Amino acid sequence: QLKMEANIDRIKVSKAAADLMAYCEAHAKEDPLLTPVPASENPFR
Amino acid sequence: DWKSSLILMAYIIIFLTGLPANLLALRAFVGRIRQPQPAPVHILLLSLTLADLLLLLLLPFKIIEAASNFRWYLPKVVCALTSFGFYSSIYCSTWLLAGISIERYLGVAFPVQYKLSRRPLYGVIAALVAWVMSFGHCTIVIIVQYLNTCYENFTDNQLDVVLPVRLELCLVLFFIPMAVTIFCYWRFVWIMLSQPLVGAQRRRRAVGLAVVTLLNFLVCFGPYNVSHLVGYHQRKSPWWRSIAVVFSSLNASLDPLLFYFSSSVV
């Protein structure tokens, strides 16, 4: 298990953080939890 | 005189403690009622708390009347209304106390049958009987005042009307519940004192609580109902009625602490 675990492709943590931030901001406008949903059109009301 | 003075701090010492205990107990009782599977215990306790609250709400009306050296400065109709409410609340409280005793006895005498046959409907019909026997029977307050002061200076017909009905009031509304409570508490004490496997501390605590409750029931509603037969024997209205009412008012203040603060809260 250790032999295959050691031989893996490990990217820089900065690139992973940048990708995570880009994914978070790209879908930020599509999150009803972040942006306050209007009372209308809301199924739960 | 000294009697009115004693009335002042007696009613004050009842007043300043009756309300908070009932107020804190009411929320717990309604929460337990709203909780799933409500036992008949909760219904009777809630009814008793409501009766105590009704009794306490009428305390200032009599307090202001008795403050002015036993002088009536209020309309006759409203005085009769408060008197009827007070007496009905007292009788409802004593009948609910009687109902609790038989329910407590059955919980220990036959716990297996009591566990698998419980239903809240049995706790509502028994409670409703107390309301029916309180409101329905306590009509003599209305008829006497409107026949032909506040329960004093009775005339010939006023005295001849209240005496023969006070015996019925003491007999069918106090004597039978008192006997039922005494028998049930004696049976519960006898059963608890001889049990197969119980804790000594729990057994002694239960026996002491039962004895305390029996003593409370036998000294709070005792003299007030005895005064009915005393007046019938003397063919006149007893003068020792206000103190009997004061003694009967102890239950309305000490019931929530007896039924709630029994080792639950230090």
Partner: protein
């Protein structure tokens, strides 16, 4: 041995902290969530829940003797299937919604077909072979299922054939939870040995392991992107791990919190991390700045489980009482 080389590679890869990178963005403001709908049909403690693909029907499992499917829009119940065993700690919803799987202390999580010609729900399949209590078995696909048990092994079964198609072993402690990646090719599995592992069902063997927790990881999740995930343990800490970095990224801990984690879920965009607790409180941590965006305290005993709809329009939490709440 190889552990030293792996640690050295991980140290070399880490050059910048996530807090330093993400400090430029504005912090997420305080958010308040209110209980729009409440479910009181249950009569005992519930231990698991799941959300359907349509984000309208949600399943819940308790010890009252049955599991119930609720229509969140109208609060009405459409199915209440009794259970052979009262002890149930896991319930799952198929992606198509045709089947529902649930299991508990018995080493069997069974699947019932919700949609039937006669209109009555019937037991479709019972899977046996595990040597421990089922922790969390999830519907990988309408044809294959994934099971996690307390015997430190995980399994992948075929519903039609009813046998262990694949077996995953290597965990030291008891496995507590698993989460499926969106592509349905990778998944994570956290055990009681303060460790988590990554497995692909296509090959049948582990890919990489992650450690750092000081307690038993009882909750796991997966980022919507699929390149990262989150874990929650009894040490009152939540740890974010990255697949491409093989190391921790953020730790969500506070001095006030002493109780452990009961459930962990991610929002639609992965910006909010909803973590349950044993103090009947749910915390909406910031997935990028580790900031408490909000606290939900609508429960009584402790938040047993929580989940987020597919569209992320609401968050539904179930506690140790017979209460189910839906916020936003």
């Amino acid at each position: 041995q190889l552990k030293n080389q792996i640690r050295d590679a991980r140290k070399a890869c880490a050059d910048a902290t996530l807090s330093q990178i993400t400090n430029n963005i504005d912090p997420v403001g305080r958010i308040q969530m209110r209980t729009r709908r409440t479910l009181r049909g249950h009569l005992a403690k519930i231990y698991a829940m799941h959300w359907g693909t349509d984000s309208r029907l949600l399943v819940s499992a308790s010890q009252d003797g049955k599991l119930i499917i609720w229509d969140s829009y109208t609060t009405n119940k459409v199915h209440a299937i009794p259970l052979r065993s009262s002890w149930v700690m896991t319930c799952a919803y198929a992606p198509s919604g045709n089947y529902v799987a649930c299991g508990g202390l018995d080493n069997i999580c069974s699947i019932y077909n919700l949609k039937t010609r006669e209109g009555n729900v019937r037991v479709s399949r019972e899977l046996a072979g595990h040597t421990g209590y089922l922790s969390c078995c999830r519907f990988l696909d309408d044809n294959q299922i994934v099971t996690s048990s307390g015997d430190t092994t995980c399994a992948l079964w075929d519903i039609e054939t009813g046998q262990q198609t694949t077996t995953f072993t290597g965990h030291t402690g008891d496995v507590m939870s698993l989460s499926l990646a969106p592509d349905t090719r990778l998944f994570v599995s956290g055990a009681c040995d303060a460790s988590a592992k990554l497995w692909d069902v296509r090959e049948g063997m582990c890919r990489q392991t992650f450690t750092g927790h000081e307690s038993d990881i009882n909750a796991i999740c997966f980022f919507p992107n699929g390149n990262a995930f989150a874990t929650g343990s009894d040490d009152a800490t939540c740890r974010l791990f990255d697949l491409r970095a093989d190391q921790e990224l953020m730790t969500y801990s506070h001095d006030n919190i002493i109780c452990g984690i009961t459930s962990v879920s991610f929002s639609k965009s992965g910006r909010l991390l909803l973590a349950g607790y044993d103090d009947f409180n749910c915390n909406v941590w910031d997935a990028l700045k580790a900031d408490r965006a909000g606290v939900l305290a609508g429960h009584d005993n402790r938040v047993s489980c929580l989940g987020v709809t597919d569209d992320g329009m609401a968050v539904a939490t179930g506690s140790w009482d017979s209460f189910l709440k839906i916020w936003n």
